[PDB]
Amino acid sequence: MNPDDIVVIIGRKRSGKSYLIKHYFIPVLKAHKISYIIDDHNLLRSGSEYSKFGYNVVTLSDIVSKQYVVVYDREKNDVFFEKLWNGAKLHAKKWGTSVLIIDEAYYHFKYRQKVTPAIDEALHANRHAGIGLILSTQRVYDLMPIVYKQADLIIMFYTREPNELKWISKYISTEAAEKVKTLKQYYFLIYDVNSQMIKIHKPIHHH
């Protein structure tokens, strides 16, 4: 396993998108000893969602010992992303190919007129660094068009919102926009950007 590609996952709260990352993607990576770093922005007072899936890096010991990492980002900032990304490049040097998992990727991948070098690298030179990406967001138009262009794989859950549907058609695939509308709950459509193919996936087993 050498997960250095870019996967974008679109889905609103309650769609089943988070259950797919949290209870499929993350555990498959863990099972294969593939390191990951989670950029988590949703601070609840009982700590956040992914707190269960990795460790907060504080000490010199953590730096060298902790392969599965959770980062709390209250910054939500280009200055923070530069660090997260430099940090990630180094994490891969230590552990081999790692996956940067960014929940609410809006915070760093939204339309900006001037793109920071770390963002440009993440989008264009991720394979050079040995960092796969999983970029998660609620609505397709949350992210800059160039994300969809640079992705290997785009995963979408059901949406009825017409501006969303129109954006999919304009930036990704007209056919994907037609089929997204037909998705039953917890089903997801996968657009493979390399092969240009669409497949509809059944809901993953849940408890």
131 three-state secondary structure: strand
Q: Give CA separation, 1 vs 5, 7, 16, 58, 102, in Å.
A: 11, 15, 25, 29, 20
* Per-residue contact flags (x/-) with ligand ANP for residues 184 to 203, judged by CB under 6 A: --x----------------x
- Cα angle 114-118-123, degrees, rounded to a multiple of 5: 85
Stretch that binds ligand ANP, among 14-22, 30-38, 64-72, 189-197 (CB under 6 A): 14-22
**Nearer Cβ to Zn ion (21/189):** 21
What is the rounded distance in angstroms from the CA atom of residue 135 to the CA atom of residue 17? 11
**Nearer Cβ to Zn ion (75/192):** 75
Shortest reach from residue 141's CB to ligand ANP, in Å? 19
Q: What are phi and psi of 19, to 5 degrees?
A: -60, -35
* Residues from 17 through 76 that contact ligand ANP (CB under 6 A): 17-19, 49
Q: Does 204 bind ligand ANP (CB under 6 A)?
A: yes
164 binds, among Zn ion, ligand ANP, none (CB under 5 to 8 A by kind): none
Task: Please give the DSSP secondary-structure letter assigned to residue 55.
Answer: B
Shortest reach from residue 130's CB to ligand ANP, in Å? 29
CA 55 from chain centre, in angstroms, equals 18
135 three-state secondary structure: strand
List of residues contacting ligand ANP (CB under 6 A): 13-19, 49, 186, 203-204, 206
